[PDB]
Every structure is written in C-alpha cells, then in structure tokens.
Design an enzyme around this catalytic site. Structure first.
Site, PDB file in Angstrom:
ATOM      1  N   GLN A 190       0.778  -1.232   0.000  1.00 46.55           N
ATOM      2  CA  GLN A 190       0.000   0.000   0.000  1.00 46.55           C
ATOM      3  C   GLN A 190       0.821   1.301   0.000  1.00 46.55           C
ATOM      4  O   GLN A 190       1.632   1.519   0.893  1.00 46.55           O
ATOM      5  CB  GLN A 190      -0.975  -0.003   1.171  1.00 46.55           C
ATOM      6  CG  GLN A 190      -2.034   1.107   1.060  1.00 46.55           C
ATOM      7  CD  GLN A 190      -3.220   0.897   1.979  1.00 46.55           C
ATOM      8  OE1 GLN A 190      -4.264   0.408   1.573  1.00 46.55           O
ATOM      9  NE2 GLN A 190      -3.054   1.241   3.210  1.00 46.55           N
TER      10      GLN A 190
ATOM     11  N   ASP B 129     -19.311  12.440 -11.271  1.00 46.86           N
ATOM     12  CA  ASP B 129     -18.113  12.396 -12.118  1.00 46.86           C
ATOM     13  C   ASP B 129     -18.354  11.455 -13.327  1.00 46.86           C
ATOM     14  O   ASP B 129     -19.498  11.304 -13.770  1.00 46.86           O
ATOM     15  CB  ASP B 129     -16.938  11.901 -11.265  1.00 46.86           C
ATOM     16  CG  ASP B 129     -15.649  12.559 -11.629  1.00 46.86           C
ATOM     17  OD1 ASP B 129     -15.084  13.279 -10.777  1.00 46.86           O
ATOM     18  OD2 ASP B 129     -15.186  12.393 -12.766  1.00 46.86           O
TER      19      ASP B 129
ATOM     20  N   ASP C 126      -9.251  -1.968  -5.216  1.00 41.54           N
ATOM     21  CA  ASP C 126      -8.999  -1.066  -4.074  1.00 41.54           C
ATOM     22  C   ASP C 126     -10.172  -0.079  -3.753  1.00 41.54           C
ATOM     23  O   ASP C 126     -10.020   0.842  -2.942  1.00 41.54           O
ATOM     24  CB  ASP C 126      -7.638  -0.363  -4.250  1.00 41.54           C
ATOM     25  CG  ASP C 126      -6.934  -0.100  -2.938  1.00 41.54           C
ATOM     26  OD1 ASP C 126      -7.159  -0.824  -1.969  1.00 41.54           O
ATOM     27  OD2 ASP C 126      -6.138   0.847  -2.849  1.00 41.54           O
TER      28      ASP C 126
ATOM     29  N   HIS D  95     -11.276   9.550 -14.781  1.00 45.21           N
ATOM     30  CA  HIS D  95     -11.364  10.690 -13.886  1.00 45.21           C
ATOM     31  C   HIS D  95     -12.118  10.309 -12.583  1.00 45.21           C
ATOM     32  O   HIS D  95     -11.581  10.464 -11.478  1.00 45.21           O
ATOM     33  CB  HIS D  95     -12.038  11.835 -14.660  1.00 45.21           C
ATOM     34  CG  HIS D  95     -11.956  13.156 -13.965  1.00 45.21           C
ATOM     35  ND1 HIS D  95     -12.966  13.633 -13.161  1.00 45.21           N
ATOM     36  CD2 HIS D  95     -10.975  14.090 -13.939  1.00 45.21           C
ATOM     37  CE1 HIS D  95     -12.621  14.811 -12.674  1.00 45.21           C
ATOM     38  NE2 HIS D  95     -11.417  15.109 -13.125  1.00 45.21           N
TER      39      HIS D  95
ATOM     40  N   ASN E 107      -5.756  -1.459   3.188  1.00 42.11           N
ATOM     41  CA  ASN E 107      -5.502  -2.906   3.081  1.00 42.11           C
ATOM     42  C   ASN E 107      -4.022  -3.032   2.749  1.00 42.11           C
ATOM     43  O   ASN E 107      -3.227  -2.167   3.133  1.00 42.11           O
ATOM     44  CB  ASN E 107      -6.441  -3.603   2.054  1.00 42.11           C
ATOM     45  CG  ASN E 107      -6.503  -2.866   0.705  1.00 42.11           C
ATOM     46  OD1 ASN E 107      -5.626  -2.071   0.393  1.00 42.11           O
ATOM     47  ND2 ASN E 107      -7.533  -3.126  -0.089  1.00 42.11           N
TER      48      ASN E 107
ATOM     49  N   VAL F 281      -3.609   2.047  -2.920  1.00 45.20           N
ATOM     50  CA  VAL F 281      -3.452   3.342  -2.223  1.00 45.20           C
ATOM     51  C   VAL F 281      -4.357   3.381  -0.996  1.00 45.20           C
ATOM     52  O   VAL F 281      -4.931   2.389  -0.613  1.00 45.20           O
ATOM     53  CB  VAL F 281      -3.708   4.552  -3.183  1.00 45.20           C
ATOM     54  CG1 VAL F 281      -2.614   4.656  -4.255  1.00 45.20           C
ATOM     55  CG2 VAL F 281      -5.109   4.459  -3.884  1.00 45.20           C
TER      56      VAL F 281
ATOM     57  N   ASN G  56      -9.417  24.972 -13.100  1.00 39.04           N
ATOM     58  CA  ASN G  56      -8.020  24.881 -13.449  1.00 39.04           C
ATOM     59  C   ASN G  56      -7.688  25.996 -14.412  1.00 39.04           C
ATOM     60  O   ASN G  56      -7.002  25.766 -15.369  1.00 39.04           O
ATOM     61  CB  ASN G  56      -7.744  23.516 -14.118  1.00 39.04           C
ATOM     62  CG  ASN G  56      -7.972  22.340 -13.161  1.00 39.04           C
ATOM     63  OD1 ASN G  56      -7.854  22.479 -11.942  1.00 39.04           O
ATOM     64  ND2 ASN G  56      -8.309  21.180 -13.710  1.00 39.04           N
TER      65      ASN G  56
ATOM     66  N   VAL H 204     -21.436  25.989  -1.931  1.00 37.87           N
ATOM     67  CA  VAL H 204     -20.509  24.960  -2.354  1.00 37.87           C
ATOM     68  C   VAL H 204     -19.118  25.371  -1.887  1.00 37.87           C
ATOM     69  O   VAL H 204     -18.774  26.539  -2.006  1.00 37.87           O
ATOM     70  CB  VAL H 204     -20.542  24.822  -3.866  1.00 37.87           C
ATOM     71  CG1 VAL H 204     -19.501  23.803  -4.367  1.00 37.87           C
ATOM     72  CG2 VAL H 204     -21.951  24.382  -4.330  1.00 37.87           C
TER      73      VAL H 204
ATOM     74  N   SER I  38      -9.655  19.065  -9.455  1.00 33.81           N
ATOM     75  CA  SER I  38     -10.447  17.810  -9.337  1.00 33.81           C
ATOM     76  C   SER I  38      -9.877  16.770  -8.355  1.00 33.81           C
ATOM     77  O   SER I  38     -10.627  15.997  -7.779  1.00 33.81           O
ATOM     78  CB  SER I  38     -10.525  17.102 -10.701  1.00 33.81           C
ATOM     79  OG  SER I  38     -11.324  17.823 -11.628  1.00 33.81           O
TER      80      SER I  38
HETATM   81 CA   LIG Z   1      -5.571   0.134  -0.525  1.00 37.27          CA
HETATM   82 CL   LIG Z   2     -12.931  -4.479  -3.156  1.00 37.17          CL
HETATM   83 CS   LIG Z   3       1.195   0.669  -4.395  1.00 35.67          CS
HETATM   84 NA    NA Z   4     -18.575  28.383  -3.210  1.00 36.19          NA
END
Ligand SMILES: [Ca+2]
Ligand SMILES: [Cl-]
Ligand SMILES: [Cs+]
Ligand code: NA
Ligand SMILES: [Cl-]
Ligand SMILES: [Cl-]
Ligand SMILES: [Cl-]
Ligand SMILES: [Cl-]
Ligand SMILES: [Cl-]
Ligand SMILES: [Cl-]
Ligand SMILES: [Cl-]
Ligand SMILES: [Cs+]
Ligand SMILES: [Cs+]
Ligand SMILES: [Cs+]
Ligand SMILES: [Cs+]
Ligand SMILES: [Cs+]
Ligand SMILES: [Cs+]
Ligand SMILES: [Cs+]
Ligand SMILES: [Cs+]
Ligand SMILES: [Cs+]
Ligand SMILES: [Cs+]
Length: 274
Positions: free
Chosen positions: A2, A32, A41, A63, A76, A80, A154, A173, A220
C-alpha cells in the site's frame, strides 16, 4: 503493498485515521465519469447514471475512479489509501467517457444524491457559467444537510480576474483550490473571492482503470480530499450540521498566503475534527 499518497498526511488525515475515525457509514456521492466498481482497491455500494449509454459502475474516462480513490481507496495491503477509507461510496455518473456532461444531468445527479440521503457530494467538475436549476439544486442540497464540495477550476490566475468556475462559485458549495506536496499553489489553480480552501492537487496518485493506479494534476484531485475530510469530521461528530462541518474545515485551515490565491489555506482535518 500500500502507498500512502502525500496528500493523506499533508492534510493530517493519517492522524485522524489512527484515532480510529475513517468515515464509517458516511455516504459520499462522487458526481463524475462514474467509477470502475470492479477495481480491487474501491468499494462502490450504489449509484446512478444520468448519462446515456453508460452504467454508473463503469468509468471509461478514469477521472471519477481517480477522484473516488482519493476519497475512499480501501485500507488494506495493496494500492493506495483514501482520506476516509470506510465511507459508503456512491458513483453518480454525470460526465461521459470524454469527461463532459450537460447541466440537466448534473442537476439530476445533485437531486439524486439529495433525495437518496447522501451526507457529502463531491463535484470534480466545473463550467465557466452555471445555471438557475444548478444554483437551486446545490442550495437545496446544502439546506437539507449535505456538505457540497467542488473543484475551484483549473484556469490559473488572470491578473485581477476571478477565474473560479461553477458550481464552486455558488456560496452553498466549498470551492477547493490545489497545492503541491510543498504546500505551494499549483499554477493551474483558479483564484478569486469565492476560493475557500486548498488541498493536494498536483502529483496526486490514486486508483485508475483498469485495476491500476495513476498520477493526475487538477483542482479535481484536490476536491475529494476535502470531501473525504468532511466524511472524517462526520464520522467523529455525527450530529454536526453541514454548516458546522464546512466552518470547521475553513476556520482551522493552515494559512498559506493571500486568500485570493489560497482561500483560508490548506485543510487540516486533525484540527477540524477535534
Ligand atoms: Ca488500498
Ligand atoms: Cl474491493
Ligand atoms: Cs502501491
Ligand atoms: Na462556493
Ligand atoms: Cl476529453
Ligand atoms: Cl497566468
Ligand atoms: Cl457567489
Ligand atoms: Cl505557500
Ligand atoms: Cl447540529
Ligand atoms: Cl484559516
Ligand atoms: Cl498575509
Ligand atoms: Cs471492488
Ligand atoms: Cs476516454
Ligand atoms: Cs446548511
Ligand atoms: Cs492562466
Ligand atoms: Cs515534498
Ligand atoms: Cs515552499
Ligand atoms: Cs477568497
Ligand atoms: Cs449530520
Ligand atoms: Cs489555523
Ligand atoms: Cs490569517
């Protein structure tokens, strides 16, 4: 094994996780390109697609899968680690595989998440203009208790010009700008009066299709850090309203410079959640 992307301790999410708060039973919707729900993961528990021809649980762009892993990549011994790896993750597909969508699909997704009890809505998207129905949708979500987070944009700086996009620019927001691992503003990060907080956005490593991991730059990538941080605060204080979560992220941020460029600064979820 990880990897812990640098964004996770930079916002001090590792310290909150180590106290045992990981976002358990907080519902986060990622609006998204969808999410590769088969990725080993990620654990996607539900969702919806407002995009013709594509289910909610596939991602032909990458994305949304990347944004989803920054929020919720499982803790795990592989891949990541997300900011809140125990959240209930929902994929709400409002963008097509080329990475764009219509205003009514987005509005639909916002409504869907408000109707279906989401606690946090992340929008790693933005447009130069915004619309009437979108304004109502985000305002109704926030008044109903949903924390709403969006990428600031961006567009970089333009001298004196406010370059923040919609829906970030709505005051319902949280507009999130981007820093790098040195806590400096990334150059593409939008600026302006509505900029609220900064998070990691340059060199962000996360889940990516198919079953792999990839580094992306953008506001993002910054936005989901703040969505996951919202989920961490709620897992620690489940009774806080959306205003209170938002004010905690804001008012405890690490000041980095002018709020025109940095909002209130770099989020620190340890200080927010305390
Ligand atoms: Ca992981
Ligand atoms: Cl999973
Ligand atoms: Cs990794
Ligand atoms: Na705002
Ligand atoms: Cl494209
Ligand atoms: Cl410039
Ligand atoms: Cl405004
Ligand atoms: Cl700085
Ligand atoms: Cl309350
Ligand atoms: Cl501050
Ligand atoms: Cl100053
Ligand atoms: Cs999975
Ligand atoms: Cs694509
Ligand atoms: Cs509110
Ligand atoms: Cs620019
Ligand atoms: Cs560094
Ligand atoms: Cs620096
Ligand atoms: Cs500002
Ligand atoms: Cs709550
Ligand atoms: Cs502070
Ligand atoms: Cs200050």
């Amino acid at each position: 094994a990880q990897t812990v992307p640098y964004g996770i301790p930079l916002i001090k999410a590792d310290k909150v996780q180590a106290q045992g708060f990981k976002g358990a039973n907080v519902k986060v919707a990622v609006l998204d390109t969808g999410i590769q729900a088969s990725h080993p993961d990620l654990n996607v528990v539900g969702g919806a697609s407002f995009v013709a021809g594509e289910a909610y649980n596939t991602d032909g762009n990458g994305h949304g899968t990347h944004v989803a892993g920054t929020v919720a990549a499982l803790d795990n011994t592989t891949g990541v680690l997300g900011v809140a790896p125990s959240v209930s993750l929902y994929a709400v597909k409002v963008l097509n595989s080329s990475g764009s969508g219509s205003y009514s699909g987005i509005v639909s997704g916002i409504e869907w998440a408000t109707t279906n009890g989401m606690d946090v809505i992340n929008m790693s998207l933005g447009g130069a203009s915004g619309s009437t129905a979108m304004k109502q949708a985000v305002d109704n979500a926030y008044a109903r208790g949903v924390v709403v987070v969006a990428a600031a944009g961006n567009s970089g700086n333009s001298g004196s010009t406010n370059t923040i996009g919609y829906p970030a620019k709505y005051d319902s927001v949280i507009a999130v700008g981007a820093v790098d691992s040195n806590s400096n503003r990334a150059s593409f990060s939008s600026v302006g009066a509505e900029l609220e907080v900064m998070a990691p956005g340059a060199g962000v490593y996360s889940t990516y299709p198919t079953n792999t991991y990839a580094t992306l730059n953008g506001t993002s990538m910054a936005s989901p850090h703040v969505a996951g941080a919202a989920a961490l605060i709620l897992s620690k204080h489940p009774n806080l309203s959306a205003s209170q979560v938002r004010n905690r992220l804001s008012s405890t941020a690490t000041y980095l410079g002018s709020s025109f460029y940095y909002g209130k600064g770099l989020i620190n979820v340890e200080a927010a959640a305390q």
